[PDB]
Design a protein around this ligand. Structure first.
Ligand SMILES: O=C(CNS(=O)(=O)CCc1ccccc1)NO
Ligand SMILES: [Ca+2]
Ligand SMILES: [Ca+2]
Ligand SMILES: [Ca+2]
Ligand SMILES: [Zn+2]
Ligand SMILES: [Zn+2]
Length: 158
């Protein structure tokens, strides 16, 4: 599959869920990018204007691609693999309730999974891996990538 062929990667947050404080959205997304840059040569920077490599979008129902969201529950988010235009972009279902904690759906943990996809990773069959297809809350303050996630990303980068 596709990978980014450059080390400096930019992201832009298109719009903000009303479910969270603005600064908490920023920090959750920043922390999620850090998870991946910690184990690759990639460097991530938030830009406030213009075209980013990775556009972060909150939206509900039909929102202009082929991956219509389904209301509360089920699909929480989806992202496109590396590439031009929409490639890399990560979309979060506004019909979920986004949080900093174990309530609703944790934005940080979902963003880690989505960014994995934005970088070229597919799903893992290992239930311990963040790239496993099923959302499961784990304490975010002690979160660590599984060995499976590390081998996956390192197979693509570095
Ligand atoms: O895989 C999907 C679609 N299904 S799921 O949304 O519900 C993925 C949610 C998820 C999975 C694992 C960890 C964190 C969030 N999107 O990337
Ligand atoms: Ca949903
Ligand atoms: Ca893009
Ligand atoms: Ca919401
Ligand atoms: Zn979408
Ligand atoms: Zn996924």
């Amino acid at each position: 599959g596709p990978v980014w062929r450059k080390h400096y990667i930019t992201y832009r947050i298109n719009n903000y869920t009303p479910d969270m404080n603005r600064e908490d959205v920023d920090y959750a997304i920043r922390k999620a990018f850090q998870v991946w840059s910690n184990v690759t040569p990639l460097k991530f920077s938030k830009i406030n204007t213009g075209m980013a490599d990775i556009l972060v979008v909150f939206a509900r129902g039909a929102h202009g691609d082929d991956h219509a969201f389904d209301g509360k529950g089920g699909i929480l988010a989806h992202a496109f693999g590396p590439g031009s235009g929409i490639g890399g972009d990560a979309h979060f279902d506004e019909d979920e309730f986004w949080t900093t904690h174990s309530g609703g759906t944790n934005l940080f943990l979902t963003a880690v999974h989505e960014i994995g996809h934005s970088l070229g990773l597919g799903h893992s069959s290992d239930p311990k891996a963040v790239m496993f297809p099923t959302y499961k809350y784990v304490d975010i303050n002690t979160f660590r990538l599984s060995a499976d996630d590390i081998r996956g990303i390192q197979s693509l980068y570095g």
